[PDB]
Design a protein around this ligand. Structure first.
Ligand code: MN
Ligand code: MN
Ligand code: MN
Length: 235
């Protein structure tokens, strides 16, 4: 199995700079939505993606999940070390969603409100859980999935890599030929619904699909940095 991918990142129409970072290679897809004043979010997302990049070089083998886990923790430690060197960066952090492929298996690591999706046999499923305030309220039965869509704090992030102790979610999944994956920052999914994302993901060529996702986000106002990685598994 091989990966045919397209990655696209845009500042949007509002923000002064782009604090999303993204990696896409032969076996690793990774997306980090950074935050922090004075472009410190660029630093956090860069540091975490750089720590994961080496996972692209070799077949993971036995402990694919432990290797993903170690890379994420190494990125988180790099943030802590960078804050030590320049204490004015305190507060900076980033989400991370990444998939590492190994034949008919993949490892998924996730923290924050970036998203991973699978499109398989015409059906779209979100394979990550949002660390947002509305997700906390849904888990407690305080609101319904429907009221979450209009809640003023619906994009509010509750957990991220900030250089402190963290436990990201690690999942092993089955991967199939014909699958299409999407990684995205909340700059896509805040303005664009899953119904619309699905239509864009059925565009045959991966680069045209990714372009369309960015276009739709910008048509919804482009309030945030928007980043996507669209990838196909083929024979
Ligand atoms: Mn950001
Ligand atoms: Mn958000
Ligand atoms: Mn964002």
């Amino acid at each position: 199995l091989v990966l045919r991918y397209a990655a696209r990142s845009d500042r949007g129409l509002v923000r002064a700079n782009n604090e999303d970072s993204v990696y896409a290679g032969a076996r690793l897809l990774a997306l980090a939505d950074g935050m922090g004043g004075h472009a410190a979010g660029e630093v956090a997302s860069q540091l975490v993606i750089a720590a994961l990049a080496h996972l692209d070089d070799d077949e993971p083998g036995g402990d694919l999940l432990a290797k993903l886990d170690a890379a994420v923790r190494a990125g988180n430690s790099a943030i802590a070390a960078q804050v030590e060197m320049e204490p004015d960066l305190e507060g900076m952090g980033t989400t991370l969603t990444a998939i590492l492929f190994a034949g008919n298996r993949l490892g998924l690591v996730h923290i924050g409100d970036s998203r991973g999706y699978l499109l398989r046999d015409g059906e779209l499923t979100q394979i990550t859980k949002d660390d947002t305030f509305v997700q906390t309220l849904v888990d407690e039965g305080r609101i319904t999935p429907e009221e979450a869509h209009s809640h003023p704090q619906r994009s509010l992030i509750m957990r991220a890599l900030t250089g402190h102790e963290v436990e990201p979610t690690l999942t092993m999944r089955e991967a199939r030929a014909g699958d299409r994956y999407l990684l995205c920052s909340d700059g896509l999914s805040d303005p664009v619904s899953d119904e619309t994302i699905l239509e864009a993901l059925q565009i045959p060529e991966v680069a045209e699909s990714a372009h369309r996702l960015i276009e739709l986000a910008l048509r919804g106002g482009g309030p945030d940095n928007v980043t996507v990685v669209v990838a196909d598994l083929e024979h």
